[PDB]
Amino acid sequence: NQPDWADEAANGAHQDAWKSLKARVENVYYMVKATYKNDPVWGNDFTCVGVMANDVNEDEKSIQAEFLFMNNADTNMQFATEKVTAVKMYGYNRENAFRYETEDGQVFTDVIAYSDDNCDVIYVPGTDGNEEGYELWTTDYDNIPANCLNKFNEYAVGRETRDVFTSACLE
Ligand SMILES: NCCc1c[nH]cn1
């Protein structure tokens, strides 16, 4: 029981999670759009989510990730550090998902629906105590790649899309 884009033979070539994780070491990834409003960590009506990574561990397929975000609870940008590991979901043989672990031990496992060198479309299954939905991440919040944007809009059909990180975040 899994999403129709979760077909490794058809789409695995564009679902390389470890490559996508390591890409966050070189450039900040900004969550430019999502289909859901709340996250247990980032808050309610969260905006302005970005992430950068370091501490690449090839043995573990892990990085350390520093996040920035805003929510309707505080006027100021918030920050958090989490471990992220590339893992397998939906029976894939090559890692296609992100396993985030917070400092308090809370785990979130999201799936790479589509990725290219500077952008990702990530699916949140909604089984972590959170809302099911999609996310669009890009290295440039002003210039959004059409390939990922089209894939996001395709897979996220039937929902309400909203903006998360935009230039307004930097006032
Ligand atoms: N879908 C985002 C899950 C998450 C990871 N870390 C904090 N929240």
Q: Any idea where the domains of the chain sit in the sequence?
A: 1-171
For 30, the 3-state DSSP assignment is strand
**Is residue 82 in contact with ligand 1, taking CB distance under 6 Å?**
yes
CA distance 51 to 137: 10
Q: How was this structure determined?
A: X-ray
Q: Which two structure tokens, joined as six digits, stand for 65?
A: 């990730």
100 C-beta closer than 6 A to ligand 1: yes
Q: From CA 158, how far away is CA 8, in angstroms rounded?
A: 24
Q: Is 120 in the pocket of ligand 1 (CB under 6 A)?
A: no
Residue 126 is given by DSSP the state: S
Structural contact between residues 113 and 119, judged by C-beta atoms closer than 8 angstroms: no
Closest CA to 87 of 17, 145, 157: 17
Give CA separation, 1 vs 7, 38, 75, 117, 122, in Å.
Answer: 12, 25, 41, 29, 18
**Contact assessment for residue 125 and residue 111, using Cβ atoms and an 8 Å cutoff:** yes
Resolution in A: 1.5
What is the Å distance from ligand 1's center to 76 Cα? 19
- 3 state SS of 165: coil
| Structure tokens given for 41 | 């960590």
Give the tokens for residue 170.
Answer: 């930097």
- Tell me how far apart the alpha carbons of residues 110 and 113 are, in angstroms, rounded to a whole number: 9
Q: How many CA atoms lie within 13 A of 130 on its CB side?
A: 23
Cα(71) to ligand 1 centroid in Å equals 14
Give the closest residue (by CA) to ligand 1 atom 4: 108
Residue the block writes with tokens 């105590």: 129
CATH topology of domain 1-171: Lipocalin (2.40.128)
Strands 62-71 and 133-138: unpaired
State whether the beta carbon of 41 lies less than 6 angstroms from ligand 1: yes
The answer to whether residues 122 and 132 touch, using CB atoms and an 8 Å cutoff, is no
Q: Please state, in angstroms and rounded to a whole number, the distance separating the CA atoms of residues 132 and 63.
A: 24
Q: Is the CB of 31 under 6 A from ligand 1?
A: no
User: Side-chain half-sphere of 36: how many Cα atoms within 13 Å?
Assistant: 16
Rounded to an integer, what distance in angstroms lies between the CA atom of residue 110 and that of residue 99?
A: 7
Q: Which amino acid is at 6?
A: A
